[PDB]
Structures are given as structure tokens and as C-alpha cells.
């Protein structure tokens, strides 16, 4: 054949390994697996197929217990990756993108939401098209302004409600992974497959205003408002299209 199959060095293959995981989390849109299958066979002694990667993500973020190594393998009590860390997080860096991801710890602390069982559709309602950052009552959005006045944090409490970014350069913080997003569209969130789709329980949008690259940055999302039902009673969460200008 013409195609010389590449043999990846430990560092090169390790970057491609993380590159594949980041695509499965849906944080990235492209992946390079050339030579990744060989790298696993020599360094890991197993085939890094889609099934293998699914268990690594599922174990690292949810079901895994005990010490973990740089390749997301766990141990409950010469060759590489036999030093199992216990720091609680791994820096998943593919070289083209990177995200700091915190290891699962079972029911200890904030959990995740199963969007296969959960699917919250919020009925539309007329509402103000523009919302001032200084007076956000929405139940999905909480805003904090700091004394410097050139930093804004928007805490999203309903990850199920899409937030679309336009002309923004942002840093996302969550109990699952931390990363930066520089592309327009719906905020990307880590999706972990475990007998269904799981996403962060909450995430924080950090907007740095001390630089010029966030000029004209604007958020478009649904403002969830708990209004009372004219009929029957109780509370039926509604929503309305709104825009929050930051820049």
C-alpha cells in the first residue's frame, strides 16, 4: 500500500488519545485517530475502540472509584501509566484544544442530570426581548458583577436550557470540566454517555471584560419565569426569548 501507517510516540499518541475523548464529550468537532489504534496496542495492551472510550468516560466521571492513571484506568487498592494518581482531576489536553476535567466521586457533592429521563420543555410566553444584566430574575440565569466591574459571571442553573453565544470568547467552569469556548452558537457542554446522556448539573459562564476580544459579546437564551397558572393553580414554568448584551 501507499499509506505508511504512522507510529506515534508516547507524547504524540497521548495527545491524540485525549483528542478522541474530547470529541466524545462533544467539546470538539474534529478528531485525529491515525496511529491511535497502534499506540494503544503497544502502550495499553488493548484496542481503543468506541466501546473502550465509552467505559473510560463513564468510569472517570461517574462510576469510577479509587485511584486513576493518566489513561483513565482505575485501581482500587518500567511500563507507562502505572502510577495511579489521586488528585481528583486530569488535564485532558489534545494539543489542539484543552479542558480540565474533574474525576467522578459518586454521590459526594453535586450530581449530574440524566437528560434521557429528563426532558423539560418550557412553554413559550410573551416577554421582554431585552433583559438588563443588573436585574435578571430568570430562574435559569444568575449574574454577578465584581468590584473591578470588568468581569461578569453568569451562573446557569438549568443546563437543559440552551444558551447561544454570539461574538464571544468565554471560559466555562463546571463541576465536570473547565474549558474556553471561542465559537458562536449554543454553549457546548460535556455529554457523558451512561445508559443515557448526562450533562453538568450546573455550569458557570465567565466573561472577561478587561480585554477587547469580548467587545459586542451578547448572550441569547430563554428566561425561565415561574408564573402561576390562571387555571387550576400551582406553578408551570414558562420561558420567553431574550437577549442580554454584555459588550
Amino acid at each position, epitope marked *: 500500500n501507499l499509506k505508511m501507517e504512522i507510529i506515534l510516540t508516547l507524547s504524540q499518541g497521548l495527545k491524540k488519545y485525549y483528542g478522541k475523548i474530547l470529541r466524545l464529550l462533544q467539546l470538539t468537532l474534529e478528531e485525529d485517530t491515525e496511529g491511535l489504534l497502534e499506540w494503544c496496542k503497544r502502550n495499553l495492551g488493548l484496542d481503543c475502540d468506541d466501546t473502550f472510550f465509552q467505559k473510560r468516560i463513564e468510569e472517570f466521571f461517574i462510576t469510577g472509584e479509587g485511584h486513576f492513571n493518566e489513561v483513565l484506568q482505575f485501581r482500587t487498592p518500567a511500563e507507562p501509566f502505572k502510577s495511579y494518581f489521586a488528585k481528583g482531576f486530569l488535564s485532558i489536553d489534545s494539543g489542539y484544544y484543552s479542558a480540565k476535567c474533574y474525576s467522578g*466521586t*459518586s*454521590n*459526594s*457533592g*453535586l*450530581q*449530574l*442530570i*440524566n437528560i434521557t429521563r*429528563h426532558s*423539560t420543555r418550557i412553554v413559550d410566553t410573551p416577554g421582554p426581548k431585552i433583559t438588563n444584566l*443588573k436585574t*435578571i*430574575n430568570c*430562574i435559569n440565569l*444568575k*449574574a*454577578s*458583577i*465584581f*468590584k473591578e466591574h470588568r468581569e461578569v459571571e453568569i*451562573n446557569v*442553573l*438549568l*443546563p*437543559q436550557v440552551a444558551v447561544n453565544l454570539s461574538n464571544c470568547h468565554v471560559v466555562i467552569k463546571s463541576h465536570v470540566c473547565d474549558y474556553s469556548l471561542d465559537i458562536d452558537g449554543a454553549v457546548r457542554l460535556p455529554h457523558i454517555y451512561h445508559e443515557g446522556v448526562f450533562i453538568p*448539573g*450546573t455550569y458557570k459562564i465567565v466573561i472577561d471584560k478587561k480585554n477587547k476580544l469580548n467587545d459586542r459579546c451578547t448572550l441569547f437564551t430563554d428566561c*425561565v*419565569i*415561574k408564573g*402561576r397558572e390562571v387555571r*387550576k*393553580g*400551582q*406553578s*408551570v*414554568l414558562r420561558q420567553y426569548k431574550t437577549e442580554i448584551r454584555i459588550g
Partner: antibody
Framework: QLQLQESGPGLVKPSETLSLTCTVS??????????WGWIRQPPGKGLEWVGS???????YYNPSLKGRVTISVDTSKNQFSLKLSSVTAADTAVYYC????????????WGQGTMVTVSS | DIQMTQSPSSLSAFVGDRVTITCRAS??????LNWYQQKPGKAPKLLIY???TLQSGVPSRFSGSGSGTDFTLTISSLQSEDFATYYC?????????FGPGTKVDIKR
């Protein structure tokens, strides 16, 4: 209005499990997610979290319970449950079921201060 | 992440005195304070559910004040029914964690 009754056991052995249960009357969670949670107070201390469920369906647990906690809603009966495992004599406390009937995120409808004590 | 502090760990005043207690945060929060008036051993009851807004079911004697990092609860005239422990609670970052609580008690 809403009303609540934390109708769980008042006494359990160490290494047993609680089953504190909070029926809600005047409504039903079938209608739509209610912000709710379990709050705790051991004697002579401030209020302490047990677990929660925002309008996301995203459970929270207080990590100091070492993951022993378990929330569950039950939409079938207008009910809530807490199933704390491996209970231990440090967990002597009163517990409050609470819902946000209104407004958006404040506990208005606290139930009655049931308590459970934990010794041989 | 957020944590709460209260300045008077206890406050004491006569019936009819105006009194204030303070709650302030480890960050800045844009309103989003609750207050609860726990009579000891009872279930608490919600007084105030955002800064400067009062629940319909409690006396007009209570009001909230301030914005940003620091807030205060005020009572325009303390009444002997006001024997209670007062907690603030923040509402910017789940879990909604309570303050340590200020015990107010009545001089006679």
C-alpha cells in the same frame, strides 16, 4: 397553600438507614418540577444541608455526609424521600422537608420539625 | 464557593427598639438573599425572599436593604414576638447555604 408531614422513623440503630418521607398536599409534582430539598439541624448548630433538587432535576448532596445521602422524588404519590445510609451517632438532628411553592427560589413551605435520634 | 458571615452573633434590645442585623458574602451577589426567622425548635418561616422584598404572610415591620456583597435586615420596632434566631441565605450558587444565624433576645 401546601402542607407537609415528615413522617419518618424517630429512632434507628447505628449502621441502619433512615426513610424520612414527605408527602405534599395541595398539589402534585406531576404538574411540574418544584424546587425542594432536605435541610438538617443537629442540636445546638445552624441549619445544614442534606440534599436538594433544583428545577433542573439536578440533585445536590452535601459532601460531608460522605455520599451516604440519597434523594428521591416520587411523582406517583406527591411524595419525597431520603434514604440516608450507614447512619451514625453524629447524625442526631432534626430534619425539615422543604419546597419552593413560591417565590422563585426560597423555601416557603417548611414541614414540621421531625427529628431522629441514633443510638443503641 | 459562597460563604456567609453575620456581624452580631447575638443581639439584644428592648421591646420597641429599632434593631438591625447584617449578613455579608464571600463574593458579590446581586440581591438573592433569603431570611428565615426560626423560633427555636420550630420550623423556620421565610421573612424576606429578595433584598427589600417582603413575603405577603409576615408583618410590614420587617424590610430588607442593600445590594451587592452586603445586606442588612431591619425591624422598625422590635416586638416580644420577635424572639427568634435569624438566618440569612444566599441565592447565587446552589447549594443555597445558610449563614450562621443571629440570636435576638429581649431585655426586660
Amino acid at each position: 397553600q401546601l402542607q407537609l408531614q415528615e413522617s419518618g422513623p424517630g429512632l434507628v440503630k447505628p449502621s441502619e438507614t433512615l426513610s424520612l418521607t414527605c408527602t405534599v398536599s395541595g398539589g402534585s409534582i406531576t404538574t411540574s418540577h418544584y424546587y425542594w430539598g432536605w435541610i438538617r439541624q443537629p442540636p445546638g448548630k445552624g441549619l445544614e444541608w442534606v440534599g436538594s433538587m433544583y428545577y433542573s432535576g439536578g440533585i445536590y448532596y452535601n459532601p460531608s455526609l460522605k455520599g451516604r445521602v440519597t434523594i428521591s422524588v416520587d411523582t406517583s404519590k406527591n411524595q419525597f424521600s431520603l434514604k440516608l445510609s450507614s447512619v451514625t451517632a453524629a447524625d442526631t438532628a432534626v430534619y425539615y422537608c422543604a419546597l419552593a411553592d413560591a417565590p422563585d427560589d426560597a423555601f416557603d413551605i417548611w414541614g414540621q420539625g421531625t427529628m431522629v435520634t441514633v443510638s443503641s | 464557593d459562597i460563604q456567609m458571615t453575620q456581624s452580631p452573633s447575638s443581639l439584644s434590645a428592648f421591646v420597641g427598639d429599632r434593631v438591625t442585623i447584617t449578613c455579608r458574602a464571600s463574593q458579590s451577589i446581586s440581591s438573592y438573599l433569603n431570611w428565615y426567622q426560626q423560633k427555636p425548635g420550630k420550623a423556620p418561616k421565610l421573612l424576606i425572599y429578595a433584598a427589600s422584598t417582603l413575603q405577603s404572610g409576615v408583618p410590614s415591620r420587617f424590610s430588607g436593604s442593600g445590594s451587592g456583597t452586603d445586606f442588612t435586615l431591619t425591624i422598625s420596632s422590635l416586638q416580644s414576638e420577635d424572639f427568634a434566631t435569624y438566618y440569612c441565605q444566599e441565592s447565587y450558587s446552589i447549594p443555597f447555604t445558610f449563614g450562621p444565624g443571629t440570636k435576638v433576645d429581649i431585655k426586660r
